[PDB]
RNA sequence: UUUUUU
């Protein structure tokens, strides 16, 4: 294929949705829905990609902008203008295929959606039913089967569920798909389950196999990314629609970056603490907050140390893949319209999440990929609002810091020292109520975390695993004392030779 | 080890 590059542009005539009603482009029903929302006016990408998406040309589309500039409505906008196009061909049938990294993500985008119908009651007729795991599959069919979707919704696992038994049936006249968070869903373990869904798509589609029309968005994408999507994108040319300057990080801007170095990984925790307690008291409580962990388990940890500290100032709700389906989805709800909190999570919740007035997004660690540092600290200052965000990492982790900037271009200006009081390290020890063995486990996580991201991050992996395990000794509060293991768990690790084992195990 | 059908 062939890549059209179209950068950002100077003094480029605004568009809105008036201009675009006049113009042909939008129909005076989805004018209305939008115009309804009381926006001041279409977001850069909005503007950008709407006429590109619904022109007449044979082209796929990559878009790229910013944390929290509404590239969700980028995409739908056009699709139900799509769908009133053509609302006599095919109308019982799945015309815009949407798939998302994660199921919370996913019903998001099906929410929005429904705001577009609670705008305009003439809409609903281009109905839309969401298909993500943890949730009752035959529940769904039922709906697929009753409303007779236009739209689908999906996470990947649970789309090719369902696209190996009713492909047939409900999927062979789909003219869009959209990878919402396109780089993370052409990642490892997500591209071939991308490649299986546009394989079954294109084999069953009724006009052709080169008919889907594919639509790429992320505030993280390069050029290199249109090379990892080459087996899934079947038009002849792919315009580059970018908002966001060639060498300007892809970080949004409005955002007050800091991050505070301690000497130990655990010492992060208490750094954490103190600040919280600080911001609680200087707010009066008047504070909305999301924590990052690397693993479930050190989340679920984090999580019982805020409790016992904060539950009497402040609300802290646990949000990772272990929780049930269900609580995933009342919790997202209520932070969604919380004034206050502590949302504390993994990775689940570094992309696409969409909390309003979030005043800092706080990180203990590394994130799961270089990239997702941008996603995460982007949950804040979302739709011309402020905020600011802290990293805290123990000096080991500061080579992550570093290729931010070689990689990234992010600097980050504000950067402090911590030590912790022996004062916050009794108070936040005495109230662990967890047992050696579950210490252990936690522990063991981070271990395993860190390994896998050594050579992304260009840790010194005799530095930083001895470190990360050494957490151990420092949550029973005797820094002598090494993870107890027996000699064939060791073995299954490959260190059984190694003196960074050595350093980071006993052999009980 | 983060997500992602069952
Ligand atoms: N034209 C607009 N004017 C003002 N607000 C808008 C507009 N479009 C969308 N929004 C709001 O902006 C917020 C963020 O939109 P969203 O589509 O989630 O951003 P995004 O670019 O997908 N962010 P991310 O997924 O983190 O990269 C939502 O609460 C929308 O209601
Ligand atoms: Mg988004």
């Given at each position: 294929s062939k890549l059209i590059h179209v950068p950002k542009e100077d003094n480029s005539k605004e568009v809105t949705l008036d201009s675009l009603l006049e113009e042909g482009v939008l129909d005076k029903e989805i004018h209305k829905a939008i115009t309804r929302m009381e926006f001041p006016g279409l977001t850069p990408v909005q503007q950008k990609t709407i006429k590109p998406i619904l022109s007449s040309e044979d082209h796929?589309?990559?878009?790229?902008?910013?944390?929290?500039?509404?590239?969700?409505?980028?995409?739908?906008?056009?699709?139900?203008?799509?769908?009133?196009?053509?609302?006599?061909?095919?109308?019982?049938?799945?015309?815009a295929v949407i798939v998302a990294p994660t199921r919370d993500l996913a019903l998001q985008i099906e929410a929005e959606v429904k705001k577009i119908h609670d705008?305009?009651?003439?809409?609903?007729?281009?109905?839309?039913?969401?298909?993500?795991?943890?949730?009752?599959?035959?529940?769904?069919?039922?709906?697929?089967?009753?409303?007779?979707?236009?739209?689908?919704?999906?996470?990947?696992?649970?789309?090719?569920?369902?696209?190996?038994?009713?492909?047939?049936?409900?999927?062979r006249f789909v003219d869009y798909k959209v990878l919402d968070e396109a780089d993370r869903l052409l990642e490892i373990g997500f591209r071939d389950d991308l490649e299986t869904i546009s394989g079954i798509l294109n084999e069953k589609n009724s006009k052709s196999a080169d008919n889907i029309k594919t639509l790429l968005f992320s505030a993280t994408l390069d050029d290199k990314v249109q090379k990892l999507a080459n087996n899934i994108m079947n038009?002849?040319?792919?315009?580059?629609?970018?908002?966001?300057?060639?060498?300007?990080?892809?970080?949004?801007?409005?955002?007050?970056?800091?991050?505070?170095?301690?000497?130990?990984?655990?010492?992060?925790?208490?750094?954490?603490?103190?600040?919280?307690?600080?911001?609680?008291?200087?707010?009066?409580?008047?504070?909305?907050?999301?924590?990052?962990?690397?693993?479930?388990?050190?989340?679920?940890?984090?999580?019982?140390?805020?409790?016992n500290e904060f539950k009497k100032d402040l609300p802290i709700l646990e949000f990772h893949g272990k929780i049930t389906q269900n609580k995933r989805t009342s919790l997202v709800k209520r932070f969604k319209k919380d004034e206050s909190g502590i949302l504390v999570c993994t990775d689940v919740g570094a992309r696409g999440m969409d909390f309003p007035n979030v005043h800092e997004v706080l990180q203990i660690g590394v994130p799961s990929e270089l990239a997702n540092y941008i996603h995460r600290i982007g949950r804040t200052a979302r739709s011309g609002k402020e905020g600011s965000s802290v990293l805290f990492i123990c000096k080991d982790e500061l080579p992550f810091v570093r290729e931010l900037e070689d990689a990234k271009n992010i600097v980050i200006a504000k950067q402090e020292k911590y030590e912790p009081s022996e004062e916050i390290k009794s108070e936040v020890l005495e109230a662990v109520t967890e047992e050696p063995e579950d210490i252990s486990?936690?522990?063991?996580?981070?271990?395993?975390?860190?390994?896998?991201?050594?050579?992304?991050?260009?840790?010194?992996?005799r530095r930083i695993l001895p470190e990360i395990a050494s957490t151990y000794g420092v949550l029973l509060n005797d820094p002598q004392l090494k993870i107890p293991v027996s000699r064939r768990f060791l073995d299954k690790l490959g260190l059984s030779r190694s003196p960074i084992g050595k350093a980071m195990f006993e052999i009980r």
């Amino acid at each position: 294929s062939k890549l059209i590059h179209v950068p950002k542009e100077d003094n480029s005539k605004e568009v809105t949705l008036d201009s675009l009603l006049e113009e042909g482009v939008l129909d005076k029903e989805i004018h209305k829905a939008i115009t309804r929302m009381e926006f001041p006016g279409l977001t850069p990408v909005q503007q950008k990609t709407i006429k590109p998406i619904l022109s007449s040309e044979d082209h796929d589309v990559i878009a790229r902008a910013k944390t929290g500039t509404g590239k969700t409505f980028a995409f739908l906008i056009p699709i139900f203008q799509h769908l009133i196009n053509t609302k006599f061909d095919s109308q019982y049938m799945v015309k815009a295929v949407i798939v998302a990294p994660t199921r919370d993500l996913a019903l998001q985008i099906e929410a929005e959606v429904k705001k577009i119908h609670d705008m305009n009651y003439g809409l609903k007729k281009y109905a839309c039913v969401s298909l993500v795991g943890g949730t009752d599959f035959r529940a769904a069919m039922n709906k697929m089967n009753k409303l007779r979707p236009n739209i689908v919704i999906a996470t990947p696992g649970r789309l090719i569920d369902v696209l190996e038994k009713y492909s047939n049936k409900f999927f062979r006249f789909v003219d869009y798909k959209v990878l919402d968070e396109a780089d993370r869903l052409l990642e490892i373990g997500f591209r071939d389950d991308l490649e299986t869904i546009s394989g079954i798509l294109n084999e069953k589609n009724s006009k052709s196999a080169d008919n889907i029309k594919t639509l790429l968005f992320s505030a993280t994408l390069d050029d290199k990314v249109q090379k990892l999507a080459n087996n899934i994108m079947n038009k002849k040319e792919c315009l580059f629609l970018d908002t966001v300057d060639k060498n300007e990080p892809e970080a949004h801007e409005r955002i007050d970056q800091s991050v505070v170095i301690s000497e130990k990984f655990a010492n992060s925790i208490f750094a954490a603490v103190e600040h919280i307690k600080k911001q609680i008291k200087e707010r009066d409580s008047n504070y909305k907050a999301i924590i990052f962990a690397p693993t479930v388990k050190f989340t679920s940890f984090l999580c019982s140390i805020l409790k016992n500290e904060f539950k009497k100032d402040l609300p802290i709700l646990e949000f990772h893949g272990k929780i049930t389906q269900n609580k995933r989805t009342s919790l997202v709800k209520r932070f969604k319209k919380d004034e206050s909190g502590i949302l504390v999570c993994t990775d689940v919740g570094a992309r696409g999440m969409d909390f309003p007035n979030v005043h800092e997004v706080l990180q203990i660690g590394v994130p799961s990929e270089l990239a997702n540092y941008i996603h995460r600290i982007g949950r804040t200052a979302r739709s011309g609002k402020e905020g600011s965000s802290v990293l805290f990492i123990c000096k080991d982790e500061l080579p992550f810091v570093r290729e931010l900037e070689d990689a990234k271009n992010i600097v980050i200006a504000k950067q402090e020292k911590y030590e912790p009081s022996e004062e916050i390290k009794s108070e936040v020890l005495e109230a662990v109520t967890e047992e050696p063995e579950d210490i252990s486990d936690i522990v063991i996580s981070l271990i395993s975390s860190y390994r896998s991201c050594i050579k992304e991050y260009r840790f010194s992996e005799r530095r930083i695993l001895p470190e990360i395990a050494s957490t151990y000794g420092v949550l029973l509060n005797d820094p002598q004392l090494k993870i107890p293991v027996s000699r064939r768990f060791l073995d299954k690790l490959g260190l059984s030779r190694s003196p960074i084992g050595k350093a980071m195990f006993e052999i009980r």
